[PDB]
Symmetry: none
Subunit: 55 residues, 6 copies
């Protein structure tokens, strides 16, 4: 390419006012709060916020 962008996040402004935030987890998988994330994966598998319980 010449002027390319791929897997790009730009120009973001975020505010989060939370008086109480609580997470309880037993034997599982919890994913919370992913923000402004970017990736590019070539010839492989790619997951951003993936939760899996058991196998």
């Amino acid at each position: 390419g010449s002027k390319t962008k791929e897997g790009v996040v730009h120009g973001v402004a975020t505010v989060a006012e939370k008086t109480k935030e609580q997470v309880t987890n037993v034997g599982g998988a919890v994913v919370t709060g992913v923000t402004a994330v970017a990736q590019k994966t070539v010839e492989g598998a790619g997951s951003i916020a993936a939760a899996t319980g058991f196998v």
Copy 2:
């Protein structure tokens, strides 16, 4: 390409005022709060916010 964009997030403004936020999980999978995420995957599988219970 010449001026390309793919898998791009730009120009985002977000506000989140939450007085109480609670997550309880047992033996499963919880995904919460994904915001302004971008990826590009070539020749592979790609998932952003995927939850799976067991296998």
Copy 3:
């Protein structure tokens, strides 16, 4: 291409005022709150906010 966009999110403004937000999960899969997400997947499978209970 020359001036392309694909899998792109731009120019977004969001507000979320929530006084109480609660998530309870047992043995399943919960996905909540995905906002302003973009991806492009080439020659592979791609899912944004997918929940699956068991296998």
Copy 4:
């Protein structure tokens, strides 16, 4: 009062995409682009976006 609001702006989300914006003024008064403004005035005169040419 007990739970009052007066002269209040809340919960606003705005987007403005403009490719070209031009303002030319000679000897006058121009007011442009007022957004999400609040005031409360007690025992006095109050104007938000007021233009006046001469006196």
Copy 5:
């Protein structure tokens, strides 16, 4: 009061994408771009975005 708000702006999210923005002024008064402004004035005069040409 007990739980009051007056002259308050909260919970605002704004985006402005402008490719070219130009202002030309001769001998006058120009006001442009006021956003998310609050005041409270007691026993006096109060103006937010006021333009006046001459006197």
Copy 6:
């Protein structure tokens, strides 16, 4: 008061992408770009973004 707010700005998120921004002024008054401003004035006159040409 007990839990008061007056002349308050909170919880603001703003984005401004501008490729070219130009201001030219001769002999006047230009006010541009006021954002997230708050004041409270007691027993006096109060103006936020006020332009005046001559006197």
